[PDB]
Ligand binder design. Structure first.
Ligand SMILES: O=C1CC[C@H](N2Cc3c(ccc4c3OCC43CCNCC3)C2=O)C(=O)N1
Ligand SMILES: [Zn+2]
Length: 109
């Protein structure tokens, strides 16, 4: 229903609350530890748009075993919004989703 927009440029829709989903047995809203020990608050959604991808998928320090990650940035302002996760194996489900930085969106949830 509600849009989630890039907090930096404000006008740009990234996804909607009805794309919010739970992977495996995790809640949709979760915090994970980055390689330097920062606690990073994310939201998992099936679909997102107005994002560029940077770099190639990587499984290093993957918060989601089985999935690789690729940095995702706002197409308009280049602010880092989150990551695209893609499955490393063909029988996994889903094959793709997005883990977005909560604090990079508006409204903030
Ligand atoms: O599944 C997920 C999504 C990506 C998320 N990452 C990945 C990552 C984050 C921060 C810094 C870095 C990084 O890899 C590259 C690096 C570490 C080596 N030095 C350069 C910068 C970060 O937060 C993570 O740990 N897990
Ligand atoms: Zn933006």
């Amino acid at each position: 229903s509600t849009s989630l927009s890039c907090k930096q440029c404000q006008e740009t829709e990234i996804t909607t609350k009805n794309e919010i989903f739970s992977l495996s047995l995790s809640g949709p809203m979760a915090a994970y530890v980055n390689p330097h020990g920062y606690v990073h608050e994310t939201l998992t959604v099936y679909k997102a748009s107005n994002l560029n991808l940077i770099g190639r998928p990587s499984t290093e320090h993957s918060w989601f075993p089985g999935y690789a990650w690729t940095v995702a940035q706002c197409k308009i302002c280049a602010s880092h919004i989150g990551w695209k996760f893609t499955a490393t194996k063909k029988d996994m489900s889903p094959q793709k989703f997005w883990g977005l930085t909560r604090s990079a969106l508006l409204p903030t949830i």
